[PDB]
Design a protein around this motif. Structure first.
Motif: not given
Ligand SMILES: COc1c(C(=O)CCC2CCN(Cc3ccccc3)CC2)cc(Cl)c2[nH]ccc12
Ligand SMILES: COc1c(C(=O)CCC2CCN(Cc3ccccc3)CC2)cc(Cl)c2[nH]ccc12
Ligand SMILES: *[C@@H]1O[C@H](CO)[C@@H](O)[C@H](O)[C@H]1NC(C)=O
Ligand SMILES: *[C@@H]1O[C@H](CO)[C@@H](O)[C@H](O)[C@H]1NC(C)=O
Ligand SMILES: *[C@@H]1O[C@H](CO)[C@@H](O)[C@H](O)[C@H]1NC(C)=O
Ligand SMILES: *[C@@H]1O[C@H](CO)[C@@H](O)[C@H](O)[C@H]1NC(C)=O
Lengths: 532, 532
Positions: B370-371, B373-375
């Protein structure tokens, strides 16, 4: 005649109202249930028994009994949401605006007010149906339902106070529309339910509830969805709060019947005075009496129902405002004030996230803090303010809604998603609050079309475009007119996840509304709390 | 005689080496310990017994026994780091470069090579001390130490294989410099130890260890610090790996004595051949035999020592390179190649984080993912590549160092911090690898001054700047010459946390080196991994 209508329950007489240098018909305060009073407090609604003679439907009904906001006396920003009629447990009525002359089988839109399930009235100035009914030539209904303990006191197992009776009030009003709206020129096969906040959640709950699905065609959800963290409780928690409500009022607690008999003896305002005392935590955006996951109105948990596709399959149109959270920080978090920029110290930020995410352990609070803190600049009072604002908004409205939209779209027959971020030029709230929770409503009801309300010309155009989107969607399941040179509002799809801005500027299409933060709120945090 | 020097251990004869159109004295391959051979494998080093006659110190010594990288046969990019001398367990020697004519009592710098504690040589081309020694007029020493199982097999309780003997080798070379360097024109009161990666962790470990503190004045740490996650193990884990080493070799595992005796009977290469098989997980940037937290070399846990200020209070100068991680992804992670852009799929990104953070549980892996990753764009092979690059570098090098620098500065006597982000014009590795782990070393040692190496004129200038910073810091504890006209490298302070870029452009000062990620790596993740 045109104002005299015979319904399955008796005759009602409407009144001719002006609307923008013209006129339409209005039937105000039509009773759809028996007054839920005395021994009927907390009980499921009973259909209104037929009356002889002509019901005077010329004036607004009483408002339901509710907490009244006295935070800012005389201030229109808060008072516009307060009951503007006498409060009474005798409050189950609906209102209807019919275009003149009376159409044949026209689209119907049914408005369900918000207010955290603890408040709200059908009679507020911003819910005035005449503009949208006139402009878009639809038959517009606004219902009402019991709020607070009167609507949602849940003692699961008891038939005297089952829980969810406020939702059943809504259902009974829908059932009434189904049965009578034809007589007003409305097509009972083309009813759209729509509502904001608690009303939006409500609309989605009727999508989920088997008992409600056949009573409407499609749904519009504004700034609320059935899975919002404040929108439901378990039967155990409902019971806990119900019992604690008794304790606060020195009730007998030996049994439900004794507890209920005692609570039925108290004046309405006695209940309201202690309503907030039953919450499990110091919190914001949390409300005491709300729908219960009971296994009856809701067959199973909301999540499994969304997962298994157990819900009404139809078109939905839904969205959020840019700054959903600011209203609630103003009322419950340190450092915030209506009359200042509300630069937020680091200490007040920490306090804020704790209030905002009441149920998180320390690790959860650290996760949230990390996710919304810029550590190159952690003493920036503004960034701290906006971060708290984003936290409250993302967690309570925006990401729960995005979770719903993604689950619904797998099974539904059409999804349209919007992001409302116009800041009205005449807002009385301070700038820092931004695009506030509830303030798209005045545009949906066409209030900007009213000269003396002093909106801008481009705001009026926006309202019209929004009304046409809403009305056109209600009629066809598509906010876009099939002809139209004008730009098109694209379908939200599982793959492309498109949505549009709603503002005074030309339409832009984006994808993945706040996906970064909503992955955090919808996937990671929930997994963290469950693991720890 | 300039080349003939009598030490406490015996006489020594150096060689006259050319350097940049001048000359200086070199003393190569001086012994500082007894050959750690036979029944002294795994044992603490013993001082070199005094010898008769004259030691020819005109050629480099053997390199210690170690894994040899054959991933890219013939490729200078990887081979420049392999042993360029015959390997032997008889490898505890040191080299010295002395300005000509011999200084009376000048600043001394002692180089400790890196190589993950499993490899390394004092004799590499890029560690050639003549350019720095000549240019900055310092006495430059490069030591050596046992690596892999030979240097760090740990069976706590045993006095035959105690662990940390490679760090004790380092100490013994430091003690030698303390005793003998004055005979070479060096001041034993002004010795700077400096090293990169494992060498940098080493330096920090001498700062911490009571037994080492008085054998040097100041310290330079390049891309490594004592608290790095790869840089040490517990006595329990160190034991498990030692025992697992025996098992991989059909050894008697019943006792330490039997196990050790079995292992002392094996050829070096047999140990090496199975070295990697003792690691706990599939991993990158993890090494089998490293320093143990033993209660002797390190009195207590590294964190508690840093917390209590239990360490040498002096001046330090330390920093990191922009893309510490890239070298390691190349060797271990899927989708990476020396000969392509290495665009990383989503599936390979997932695989990479698991390899990169092998101790994390599933919750932890999700957190890391999560920290980084560009979602909005999770299938971008580039962002995925660079993301994983940052993960490896932040976790293994940058954030460990930032924790160290912050803890140390609360007690120390001056901290200077740098961020090396120059990609050399003549690099043989692909562009995606960026500013690689180890590639500031050629600048510190002045290779760009050698015109045949074909560095740019501005790269020569950068090298000269860096050599002057290092040497001036060595002499005075401050990389700056006050009264000078050039831009000043400011002290890192607890409040302002300033640091500088090292590259070919005019100096820039920044603050809080990668704070956001290092708060994640240093505060949040460890809290998350500790809860269940
Ligand atoms: C945080 O919990 C509260 C609240 C609130 O929930 C926020 C107050 C405003 C929430 C928006 N209202 C306007 C509106 C109405 C219908 C649809 C949209 C908008 C007006 C009041 C209020 C009070 Cl008085 C509380 N007291 C203790 C705890 C607590
Ligand atoms: C063959 O090596 C491995 C690894 C590695 O970590 C290799 C990466 C190094 C490759 C050469 N180094 C060059 C250098 C030396 C000094 C200072 C700076 C840079 C540094 C990175 C991991 C695993 Cl799991 C391996 N398994 C077998 C073999 C092997
Ligand atoms: C209905 O009520 C209003 C006032 O509440 C009154 O003015 C009006 O005349 C009433 N209508 C009839 C038909 O009595
Ligand atoms: C809605 O249903 C019809 C008929 O089942 C189908 O052809 C159409 O593609 C559906 N539309 C969407 C948007 O799912
Ligand atoms: C020392 O070694 C060098 C290099 O092999 C050699 O040329 C020289 O003759 C040796 N010196 C003595 C005195 O043996
Ligand atoms: C270093 O220590 C000396 C000795 O007391 C002191 O005067 C000086 O202020 C210290 N410098 C720093 C940067 O802490």
């Amino acid at each position: 005649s045109e104002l005299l209508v015979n319904t399955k329950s008796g005759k009602v007489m409407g009144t001719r109202v002006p609307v923008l240098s013209s006129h339409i018909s209005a039937f105000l305060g039509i009773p759809f249930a028996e007054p839920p009073v005395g021994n009927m407090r907390f009980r499921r609604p009973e259909p209104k028994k037929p009356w002889s003679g002509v019901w005077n439907a010329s004036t607004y009904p009483n408002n339901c009994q509710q907490y009244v906001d006295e935070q800012f006396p005389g201030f229109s920003g808060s008072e516009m949401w307060n009951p503007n009629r006498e409060m009474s447990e005798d409050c189950l009525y609906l209102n209807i605006w019919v275009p003149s002359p009376r159409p044949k089988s026209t689209t119907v839109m049914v408005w369900i007010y918000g207010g955290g399930f603890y408040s709200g009235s059908s009679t507020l100035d911003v819910y005035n149906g005449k503009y949208l009914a006139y402009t878009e030539e639809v038959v517009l209904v606004s219902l009402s339902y019991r709020v607070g303990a009167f609507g949602f006191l849940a003692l699961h197992g008891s038939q005297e106070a089952p829980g969810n009776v406020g939702l059943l009030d809504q259902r009974m009003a829908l059932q009434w529309v189904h049965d009578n709206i034809q007589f007003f020129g409305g097509d009972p096969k083309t009813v759209t339910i729509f509502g904001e906040s608690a009303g939006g959640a409500s609309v989605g709950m009727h999508i989920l509830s088997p008992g409600s699905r056949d009573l409407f065609r499609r749904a519009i959800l504004q700034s609320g969805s059935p899975n919002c963290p404040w929108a439901s409780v378990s039967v155990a928690e409902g019971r806990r709060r119900a019992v604690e409500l008794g304790r606060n009022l020195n009730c007998n607690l030996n049994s439900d019947e004794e507890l209920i008999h005692c609570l039925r003896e108290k004046k309405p305002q006695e209940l309201i005075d202690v309503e907030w005392n039953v919450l499990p935590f110091d919190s914001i955006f949390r409300f005491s009496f709300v729908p219960v996951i009971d296994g009856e109105f809701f067959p199973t948990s909301l999540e499994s129902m969304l997962n298994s596709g157990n819900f009404k399959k139809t078109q939905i149109l839904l969205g959020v405002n840019k700054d959903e959270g600011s209203f609630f920080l103003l009322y419950g978090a340190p450092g915030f004030s209506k009359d200042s920029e509300s630069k937020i110290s680091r200490e007040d930020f920490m306090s804020g996230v704790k209030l905002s995410v009441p149920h998180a352990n320390d690790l959860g609070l650290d996760a949230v803090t990390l996710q919304y803190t810029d550590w190159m600049d952690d003493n920036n009072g503004i960034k701290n303010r906006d971060g708290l604002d984003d936290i409250v908004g993302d967690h309570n409205v925006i990401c729960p809604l995005m979770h719903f939209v993604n689950k619904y779209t797998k099974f539904g027959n059409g999804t349209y998603l919007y992001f409302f971020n116009h800041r009205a030029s005449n807002l009385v709230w301070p700038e820092w609050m931004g695009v506030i929770h509830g303030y798209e409503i005045e545009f949906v009801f066409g209030l900007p079309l009213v000269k003396e309300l002093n909106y801008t010309a481009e705001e009026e155009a926006l309202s019209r475009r929004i009304m046409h989107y809403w009305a056109t969607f209600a009629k066809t399941g598509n906010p876009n007119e099939p002809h139209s040179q004008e730009s098109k509002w694209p379908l939200f799809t599982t793959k492309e996840q498109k949505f549009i801005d709603l503002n005074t500027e030309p339409m832009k299409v984006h994808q993945r509304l706040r996906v970064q933060m909503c992955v955090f709120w919808n996937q990671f945090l929930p997994k963290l709390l469950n693991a720890t």
